[PDB]
Each structure stands twice: as structure tokens, then as C-alpha cells.
């Protein structure tokens, strides 16, 4: 996702899915990689401490000045047309300078984007409609002209472009938190279970302190974490040895 040679276009972006694996987020700060790393919904440094169930990464390339328009609540020809994040979006956004690679001579036509649309697109939706954008009352008849423009345009990429006009490889990091068991977590080794003693327990992402004993409750085959009338933690299911 991050180190891939070529990403997809932001007009239609490839979403790579990562689940059931070991995610090492410490290697990022151990070996410097991301040039621009910022997290809107979470902290930049807390990805390693807390781990998530499913990971969703959208790899795409956009112009420099177009990076700030991808974020919850932001507006622009990107957020409002091709790629839109939801207002409640919780995740991270990464960017770095590929200009010495992606840029070819006068331009690169492999990365394209929607420069025009007749409305505001919904978040997490890929619109393949090529319909000519009509700004005025003149009928376009499916061709360019006065107040008639083709919505999908290609990014100008050149080695001589300025910091704002140079390409930056962008990858949006989305995740699912506490909606399922955690299949993506770092090298955290499981230890032996302690009973009849007060201990600090971390079970399938549930952290807390309490005495661990054998419960008389009978969970159904699909049930996992029990809770009392107070909606607190009553009994839990050990994900390793059931």
C-alpha cells in the first residue's frame, strides 16, 4: 500500500484490505519513511499502542495543493467531486514527495481526477460518470464548448513544478475499532492466564483490572463478552483457549 511502486488514480482508487496479520507501526519511527504524516481522528504516535480489527488503505496520487482538501469537513474540487471523506471520518492521511519518479517530462496521464461535477458527491463512493459538465444553459450535446467541460482531467506532472504543483503520493488509512475481534495487532506476545488473583488484564483489546475466576454463566456458541445490567464487563471469552 505505502511502498507500492505505482498507486491508482484518485478518480477511481484501489482500496487494499489488510486483516489477520501482524502490524508493526514502530518501524515507521525507527526507520524514517513518511514525509508528511498526520492523523485527524487519532494521534500519529498512538497507532502502535492501540491496534485495530480491519485496516482499509486507499492508495492514490494527487497534486500538491490538493492534499489539504482531503479531510473531514473540508471543501474543494476533490472533497466535493471525486474523493470525499465523511464528516465523522476517523483515520489518518499520509503524503510524501514522489516528484523525482511519477513526473514524466511534461505530464503524466496515468493519474486523472474529476475536475467538474454538477453536485456534491457522497463519501466513500466512486463515480465513473463521464457526463459533460454543463455550467450554463447552452446544451453541451456531449462535447466541450462554452460552459461545457469534460469532468475527468489529468494531473500535470513535471520535474520542474513547484512544491505546490509537484505530485505527492497519498494513502488514506481507515480502520474499524472495537466492532469485531482484533485481527491486526503488533508483536504483542500472549502470556499465561492467572486466576484467583487481582491482575491487569488485556483480552482481545479489552484493558482493565479485576479478579479473574471461572464463571458459572453459560454463553451461547456465538456469544463472547458478557455484561451486567450496568452495561459493564461481567465475563469475557478468552480468544486463545476458549
Amino acid at each position: 500500500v505505502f511502498n507500492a511502486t505505482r498507486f491508482a488514480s484518485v478518480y477511481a482508487w484501489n482500496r487494499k484490505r489488510i486483516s489477520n496479520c501482524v502490524a508493526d507501526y514502530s518501524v515507521l519511527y525507527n526507520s524514517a519513511s513518511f514525509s508528511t504524516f498526520k492523523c485527524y481522528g487519532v494521534s500519529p504516535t498512538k497507532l502502535n499502542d492501540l491496534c485495530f480489527t480491519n485496516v482499509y488503505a486507499d492508495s492514490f496520487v494527487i497534486r500538491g495543493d490538493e492534499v489539504r482538501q482531503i479531510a473531514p469537513g473540508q471543501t474543494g474540487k476533490i472533497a466535493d467531486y471525486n474523493y470525499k471523506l465523511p464528516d465523522d471520518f476517523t483515520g489518518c492521511v499520509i503524503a510524501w514527495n514522489s516528484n523525482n519518479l511519477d513526473s514524466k517530462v511534461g505530464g503524466n496521464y496515468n493519474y486523472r481526477y474529476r475536475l467538474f461535477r454538477k453536485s456534491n458527491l457522497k463519501p466513500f463512493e466512486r463515480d465513473i460518470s463521464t457526463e459533460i459538465y454543463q455550467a450554463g444553459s447552452t446544451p453541451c450535446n456531449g462535447v466541450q464548448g462554452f460552459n461545457c467541460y469534460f469532468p475527468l482531467q489529468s494531473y500535470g506532472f513535471q520535474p520542474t513544478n513547484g512544491v505546490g504543483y509537484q505530485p505527492y503520493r497519498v494513502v488514506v488509512l481507515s480502520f474499524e475499532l472495537l466492532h469485531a475481534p482484533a485481527t491486526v495487532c503488533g508483536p504483542k506476545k500472549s502470556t499465561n492466564l492467572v486466576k484467583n488473583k487481582c491482575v491487569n488484564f488485556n483480552f482481545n483489546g479489552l484493558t482493565g483490572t479485576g479478579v479473574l475466576t471461572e464463571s458459572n454463566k453459560k454463553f451461547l456458541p456465538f456469544q463472547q463478552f458478557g455484561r451486567d445490567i450496568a452495561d459493564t464487563t461481567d465475563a469475557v471469552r478468552d480468544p486463545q483457549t476458549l
Binding site: 484490505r17 480491519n54 482499509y56 454463566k217 453459560k218 456465538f222 463478552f225 458478557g226
Partner: protein, 262 residues
């Protein structure tokens, strides 16, 4: 292989009372001896549910809208409906989900599919052995880009038997929300002809599919020289979930014995 078979009699639309049903376990959290209020997509009580047929004469498997989840309940015999279809275009313009139940196992696969105009499952009937054997599997013409696949634990299912009326009752709930496709299932026997029993039971979770696919419509797969077939007697239900708030009653054993619709 693909064959377009239309010879059938058209029937007028019909509806049935839902009574109290379509209730499922929202989460795997365990609770007992408590009254918990939950607001999520459910089937409103005492609503109108659609009524469809597979007769002899009548073979009903069109493409139906899928919005905010859909409720499935089937009164059948000898397992007439062995699968379902889901997606948007289903012409191989975009990826789609396909769920088919093979005799030994269930197959869940996601690809770019081109579906036959009239998908059906062929079976030999009384050829020289007096017995029945499954032969032709016809659903999609081609599959190009595949991503997700899953195979259920193997089992054995019987495709045979002459039983007169319907016996098994299946109730399923499917939802596509935020790219997550969830499945809720329950099975109970019944004795009756065309009618839905009256009762209240909660649906247990079975499979959770995070396929991230956009499903605006669904279609059903029914079991059936290469043209023409005899459709076994079957009927199934299609409901529509709604964001209703219910008060669930958890008993001592941690099951839902009652529900109250606000």
C-alpha cells in the same frame, strides 16, 4: 452454460402478515435477566411481507431491490432454493456477491460475474436408476476478477423425497452496511401448506462478510433437452427492515423470549 427458459403463468402480487418476527441478536454481547432497549434496523411487527412461488407453472426468481437490509423467510421442501444472488449490475460491469449451497458445502465467492438471464440448478430425475442425481450447475457465464472466497464446513444434504407439504422453515436476514455484509440465520420445522407460522424467535449470527461491495439488488437461485424444467413446490418471503426501537427481554439462559415495539 446459460439457457433462457420462460414458460409460466403470471400470478398477482400478494402479501402476508409478519406477526412478530425478523428480530435478531444485534451483538455477541451476553446479557441475562434484563430488559435492554436497542435501536437498529429491524422488521416492523404486523407488517406486510411479500409472497412468491415456485410451482410445478410458476417459477419466480426476478431481481428485487435491496435497501436498508432485507428479510428472507422460506417455506420449502427438499431444498428448492439452494442459493441467492447479490450485487448491482451483475453483468460483469462491477463486482458482485454469489452464494450457492452445494450438496456437500456452501460456497461464498466474490468476483466480477456475468449472470445467466435465468439461473437454475439442473437435476436428473428417474433416469434408469429410479433415483435422482445433481448434474448441471448454471449460474454465471464467466468470472474475471476474483477477490474474496469462503467455503463452509462440509456436510451432507438430501435433494430427494416426495413429501407432500412443506416441512423445513428457514429465516435469514442480510444487510449491506458500511461495506460489511452480515448474515443472521435460524432454522425450525413446520407443518403447514402455504402459510407462515405465528411465533416469536430470535435469529442467531452465522457468517459475517466484510466484502465492501455495493449491493442494490438481489435474486434467488432455485433448483430444477437442455430447455424446459419442472419446478418443485416452494414459497419464500421478502421483507424490508426499518430503523425501529425494540425492547428485548433477556431470560436467565441469555435468550430473547419477548420483544416490545416502541
Amino acid at each position: 452454460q446459460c439457457v433462457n427458459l420462460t414458460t409460466r403463468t403470471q400470478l398477482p402480487p400478494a402479501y402476508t402478515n409478519s406477526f412478530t418476527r425478523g428480530v435478531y441478536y444485534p451483538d455477541k454481547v451476553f446479557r441475562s435477566s434484563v430488559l435492554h432497549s436497542t435501536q437498529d434496523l429491524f422488521l416492523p411487527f404486523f407488517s406486510n411481507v411479500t409472497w412468491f412461488h415456485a410451482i410445478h407453472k410458476r417459477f419466480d426468481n426476478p431481481v428485487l431491490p435491496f435497501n436498508d437490509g432485507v428479510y428472507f423467510a422460506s417455506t420449502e421442501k427438499s431444498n428448492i432454493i439452494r442459493g441467492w444472488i447479490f450485487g448491482t449490475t451483475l453483468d460483469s460491469k462491477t463486482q458482485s456477491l454469489l452464494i450457492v449451497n452445494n450438496a456437500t458445502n456452501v460456497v461464498i465467492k466474490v468476483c466480477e460475474f456475468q449472470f445467466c438471464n435465468d439461473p437454475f440448478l439442473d437435476v436428473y430425475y428417474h433416469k434408469n436408476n429410479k433415483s435422482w442425481m445433481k448434474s448441471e450447475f448454471r449460474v454465471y457465464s464467466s468470472a474475471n476478477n476474483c477477490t474474496f472466497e469462503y467455503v463452509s464446513q462440509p456436510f451432507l444434504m438430501d435433494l430427494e423425497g416426495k413429501q407432500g407439504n412443506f416441512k423445513n422453515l428457514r429465516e435469514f436476514v442480510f444487510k449491506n452496511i458500511d461495506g460489511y455484509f452480515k448474515i443472521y440465520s435460524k432454522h425450525t420445522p413446520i407443518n403447514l401448506v402455504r402459510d407462515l407460522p405465528q411465533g416469536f424467535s430470535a435469529l442467531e449470527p452465522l457468517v459475517d462478510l466484510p466484502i465492501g461491495i455495493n449491493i442494490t439488488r438481489f435474486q434467488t437461485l432455485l433448483a430444477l433437452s437442455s430447455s424446459g424444467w419442472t419446478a418443485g413446490a416452494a414459497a419464500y418471503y421478502v421483507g424490508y427492515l426499518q430503523p425501529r426501537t425494540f425492547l428485548l427481554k433477556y431470560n436467565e439462559n441469555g435468550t430473547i423470549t419477548d420483544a416490545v415495539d416502541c
